[PDB]
Amino acid sequence: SKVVVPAQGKKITLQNGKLNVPENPIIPYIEGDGIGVDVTPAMLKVVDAAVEKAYKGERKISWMEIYTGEKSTQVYGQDVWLPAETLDLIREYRVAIKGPLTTPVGGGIRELNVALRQELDLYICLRPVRYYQGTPSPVKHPELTDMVIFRENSEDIYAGIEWKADSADAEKVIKFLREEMGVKKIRFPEHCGIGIKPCSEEGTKRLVRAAIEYAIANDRDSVTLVHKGNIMKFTEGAFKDWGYQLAREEFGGELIDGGPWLKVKNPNTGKEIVIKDVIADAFLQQILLRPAEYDVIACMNLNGDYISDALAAQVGGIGIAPGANIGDECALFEATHGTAPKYAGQDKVNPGSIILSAEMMLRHMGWTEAADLIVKGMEGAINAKTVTYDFERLMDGAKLLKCSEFGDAIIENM
Amino acid sequence: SKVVVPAQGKKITLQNGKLNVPENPIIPYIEGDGIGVDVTPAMLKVVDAAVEKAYKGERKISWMEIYTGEKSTQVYGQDVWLPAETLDLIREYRVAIKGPLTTPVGGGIRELNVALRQELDLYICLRPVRYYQGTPSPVKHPELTDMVIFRENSEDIYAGIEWKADSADAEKVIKFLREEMGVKKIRFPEHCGIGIKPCSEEGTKRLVRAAIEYAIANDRDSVTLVHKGNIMKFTEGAFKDWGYQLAREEFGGELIDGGPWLKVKNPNTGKEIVIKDVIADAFLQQILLRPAEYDVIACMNLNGDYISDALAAQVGGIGIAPGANIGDECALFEATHGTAPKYAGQDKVNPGSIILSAEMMLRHMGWTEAADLIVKGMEGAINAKTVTYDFERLMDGAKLLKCSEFGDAIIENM
């Protein structure tokens, strides 16, 4: 209704589990708030150059701007932060990419990134972190890290089922918990905010299934379920049990003797994938001390949020960390950083995150060659020390480029 | 009843907020399970040598062994993992130290470390991490880290208020949540485990008060409240608001203009303590990228657990990280690592954690000189590269000592 759908261009189609991508697909993009106005132009220019170079003119993307966050209120009116048509258009065109969003405070509105993932049921948050050679790192051996995070997006404490201290509602659930449930373990029942943490079997088995399938399809060495189940037995503990169960029941998992770890034989390479588990807090230490020991990671919402943020900081990739939200009907690729309002419009921040999320998009669409050209450009720009301010500060001998220019460095290294 | 209270020795007394420590105080200790049988002998020998050297014979500790975990079932019978008298004796003698505990699986028993902290209301988990010069680290600059963690011990998802998927109980609370509360946001209400997360005002203001007071008493530069309140508004968000509020209301906090950060003037040094906040997941990145920016840390149960584990791994201190649990009536000092059953009895693990927790104990008792001798011994053993297997693997030029011998290295560097 305020989106202009492209005259040339054809919708991607879902023909039962498989995307059928036209040569001129319409891809919806949300520019983003803040520095989105800087990074999104740079991504449109490098994805274009990459599909121009890979398919020699045969394919072209028809970008269609859709609206969410702050820009959605300048186009549809001050009150609408998430238009209902954005959810239909992402549903309909199947794959979309987006910049960073601003959620307002003061108006009772919940975190718009999380609202997109729950409203479209994009239950997989997929976060790949690997080291790009030559990026400044705080650790000794960033190159030992190469992990793929499968974070459950639809449940956990992150669902935002909670009530305010001294509200009638909070009072009412605390009364129910103490009188009807007999909970004698709330230290201070007065002035007490209450959060609900759900974990279901359908919720963990659809995420863990997507994680093992990723490991078979890409011959990864292992799947680690990380959880905090020694303390949260019936949610985090339930997640680890349901994940091991699904590996035995659907993938023919077998004990590496005495257990608890399982072997899954890859039906294609013949190799064995170890299914193992480690407690979340010891895991946060393990990724620093022994990163080469881990590979595909499956976890719940909150843990996945922390794991991905920590891992991305150790490889120097806070501003180049890619991400996707995948459900059964559509996928939403995204810049994983914030809107950084100070720098907005100055053309200086790293467009690295949204560009590498675009390579994940291209790859997901089957346009592997275009996708490969973007990570070739990336490795080359970085190695050329021809870099944006956030990497140049920490580097000796770098050439400082604006955000737009780093886009052009990616195209020149293609 | 099976504890033998020492014939010589006198009880520490609480004379309203202040400990009055005798020259021969009786200190209860729980040996611990696993490697506790190795590390606890080493701590008793170095604390002894340190109070022998500091006060030239005038003071002596009268150790009284009390029982919890696996050793409690060999002494009181197979069923009793936490004797009710252990809670009276810690209550009564005011300060205790303990080794690592085994919680059993299969018998419905909750994590005994957490049960001690809740049963005695030891609401402060205090975790100091600093770098000891010359220890192997995975990061470039471990010396930039010097933080003190104030972790809330009595509330959060850690209280273990939860029910099993498909239990009558879980069914009943999900029915209450969907019908009486109108929650339309549980993705999968069937086969769904439910955890409760409480956060109260009394719970966060008593922990944050202990954190600011620590910063005034030790002239630390800042207090950072780390929370995940952009998503959990009424618990994590409540914690950050109640912490800022208590800094304005009880410490005369003032805006560093426009806010949200506050200044507290130290009533003794005249210096200003900045009270600030950072979101938990960005914090996990910040401690790696800019550790020198942070100092005293206040957080809820789970976040504090992760923060302390991550920070201890970056300074190479997973096996020498000290910890205390402080309430108003007693304090429980502890080895923060696990029981490591493989190595138990082999006299080879690092006694570093329980020894440095003993220095915190000594310090808490007012025996500052004895406490100072132990960290002098520690710095010296490490610098001498006269070290236990866990540090020696990673070091070039080290001398490998057994667990007992490293105790003696600490005494020889005193």
Short mmCIF file of C-alpha atoms in Angstrom, two decimals, chain B residues 134-273:
data_model
loop_
_atom_site.label_atom_id
_atom_site.label_comp_id
_atom_site.label_asym_id
_atom_site.label_seq_id
_atom_site.Cartn_x
_atom_site.Cartn_y
_atom_site.Cartn_z
CA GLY B 134 52.85 -14.90 34.27
CA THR B 135 49.82 -17.25 34.07
CA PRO B 136 49.04 -18.61 30.52
CA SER B 137 46.17 -16.80 28.93
CA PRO B 138 44.20 -17.22 25.64
CA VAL B 139 44.00 -13.45 25.13
CA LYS B 140 46.52 -10.78 24.20
CA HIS B 141 46.16 -8.51 27.28
CA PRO B 142 44.89 -10.44 30.40
CA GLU B 143 46.54 -7.86 32.64
CA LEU B 144 43.89 -5.24 31.67
CA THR B 145 41.34 -7.30 33.63
CA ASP B 146 40.67 -6.53 37.21
CA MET B 147 37.01 -6.89 38.07
CA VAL B 148 34.97 -7.78 41.13
CA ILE B 149 31.62 -9.54 40.48
CA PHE B 150 28.67 -9.05 42.70
CA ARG B 151 26.24 -11.72 41.64
CA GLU B 152 22.82 -11.93 43.27
CA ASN B 153 22.46 -15.40 44.80
CA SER B 154 18.83 -15.76 46.03
CA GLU B 155 16.48 -15.07 43.18
CA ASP B 156 16.42 -15.43 39.30
CA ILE B 157 15.60 -18.55 37.23
CA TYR B 158 18.28 -20.18 39.44
CA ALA B 159 15.77 -20.54 42.36
CA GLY B 160 14.57 -23.78 40.64
CA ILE B 161 10.89 -23.02 40.43
CA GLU B 162 9.90 -25.23 37.51
CA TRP B 163 7.74 -28.07 36.32
CA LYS B 164 8.16 -30.94 33.94
CA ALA B 165 6.60 -31.08 30.48
CA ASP B 166 3.38 -33.17 30.59
CA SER B 167 3.29 -33.18 34.40
CA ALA B 168 -0.03 -32.37 36.00
CA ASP B 169 1.67 -29.34 37.57
CA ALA B 170 3.09 -27.93 34.32
CA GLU B 171 -0.31 -28.57 32.70
CA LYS B 172 -1.98 -26.72 35.54
CA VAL B 173 0.26 -23.65 35.38
CA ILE B 174 0.00 -23.51 31.53
CA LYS B 175 -3.79 -23.69 31.84
CA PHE B 176 -3.68 -20.82 34.42
CA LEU B 177 -1.38 -18.80 32.12
CA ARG B 178 -3.50 -19.27 28.97
CA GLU B 179 -7.00 -19.08 30.49
CA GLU B 180 -6.66 -16.88 33.56
CA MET B 181 -3.75 -14.73 32.41
CA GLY B 182 -4.53 -14.63 28.68
CA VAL B 183 -1.00 -15.50 27.54
CA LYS B 184 -1.17 -16.13 23.84
CA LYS B 185 2.61 -16.36 23.42
CA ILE B 186 3.63 -19.93 24.44
CA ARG B 187 4.40 -21.42 20.91
CA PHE B 188 3.82 -25.01 22.00
CA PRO B 189 1.62 -25.44 25.12
CA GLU B 190 1.70 -29.22 24.91
CA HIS B 191 4.90 -31.10 26.04
CA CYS B 192 6.21 -27.92 27.60
CA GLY B 193 8.48 -27.45 30.67
CA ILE B 194 7.92 -24.21 32.63
CA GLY B 195 10.58 -22.20 34.55
CA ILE B 196 9.76 -19.16 36.82
CA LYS B 197 12.11 -16.18 36.95
CA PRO B 198 11.59 -13.79 39.97
CA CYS B 199 13.23 -10.45 40.50
CA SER B 200 12.22 -8.32 43.51
CA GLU B 201 13.22 -4.83 44.72
CA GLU B 202 14.49 -6.06 48.13
CA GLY B 203 16.52 -8.68 46.30
CA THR B 204 18.21 -6.26 43.90
CA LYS B 205 18.65 -3.30 46.27
CA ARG B 206 20.37 -5.43 48.99
CA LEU B 207 22.82 -6.78 46.35
CA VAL B 208 23.49 -3.45 44.62
CA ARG B 209 23.98 -1.77 48.06
CA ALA B 210 26.68 -4.35 48.91
CA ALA B 211 28.25 -3.64 45.47
CA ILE B 212 28.45 0.26 45.89
CA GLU B 213 29.65 -0.13 49.45
CA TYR B 214 32.38 -2.41 48.19
CA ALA B 215 33.36 0.27 45.63
CA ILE B 216 33.46 3.07 48.32
CA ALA B 217 35.38 0.88 50.76
CA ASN B 218 38.00 0.02 48.17
CA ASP B 219 37.95 3.14 46.03
CA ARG B 220 37.03 1.31 42.90
CA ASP B 221 36.26 3.47 39.81
CA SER B 222 32.78 2.18 38.90
CA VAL B 223 29.84 -0.02 39.35
CA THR B 224 28.27 -1.52 36.24
CA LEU B 225 24.79 -3.05 36.47
CA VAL B 226 24.60 -5.63 33.69
CA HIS B 227 21.34 -6.84 32.73
CA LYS B 228 19.27 -8.08 29.72
CA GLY B 229 16.42 -5.60 30.26
CA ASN B 230 15.69 -4.62 26.65
CA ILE B 231 14.10 -8.04 26.41
CA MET B 232 13.25 -8.86 30.05
CA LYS B 233 11.76 -5.60 31.10
CA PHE B 234 10.17 -6.59 34.40
CA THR B 235 12.95 -8.60 35.89
CA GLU B 236 16.35 -7.66 34.34
CA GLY B 237 15.02 -4.18 33.52
CA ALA B 238 13.56 -3.90 37.01
CA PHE B 239 17.04 -4.80 38.36
CA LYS B 240 18.72 -1.93 36.44
CA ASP B 241 16.05 0.57 37.49
CA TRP B 242 16.04 -0.42 41.16
CA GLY B 243 19.90 -0.29 41.09
CA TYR B 244 20.03 3.27 39.73
CA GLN B 245 17.26 4.29 42.08
CA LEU B 246 19.13 2.95 45.13
CA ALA B 247 22.26 4.82 43.91
CA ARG B 248 20.30 8.13 43.74
CA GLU B 249 18.20 7.59 46.90
CA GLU B 250 20.89 6.13 49.26
CA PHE B 251 24.21 7.33 47.82
CA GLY B 252 23.31 10.74 46.45
CA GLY B 253 23.81 9.73 42.85
CA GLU B 254 23.88 12.47 40.26
CA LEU B 255 23.43 12.55 36.47
CA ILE B 256 26.54 12.71 34.27
CA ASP B 257 24.53 15.01 32.00
CA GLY B 258 21.49 13.88 30.28
CA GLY B 259 22.15 10.56 31.91
CA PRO B 260 21.65 7.65 32.32
CA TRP B 261 24.93 7.29 34.19
CA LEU B 262 25.35 8.52 37.77
CA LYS B 263 28.11 9.79 39.94
CA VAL B 264 28.55 8.79 43.52
CA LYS B 265 31.21 10.73 45.42
CA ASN B 266 33.26 8.44 47.67
CA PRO B 267 32.69 9.93 51.19
CA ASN B 268 36.27 8.96 52.04
CA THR B 269 38.55 9.53 48.99
CA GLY B 270 36.44 12.28 47.49
CA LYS B 271 36.66 10.55 44.07
CA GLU B 272 33.68 9.81 41.83
CA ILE B 273 32.36 6.37 41.24
#
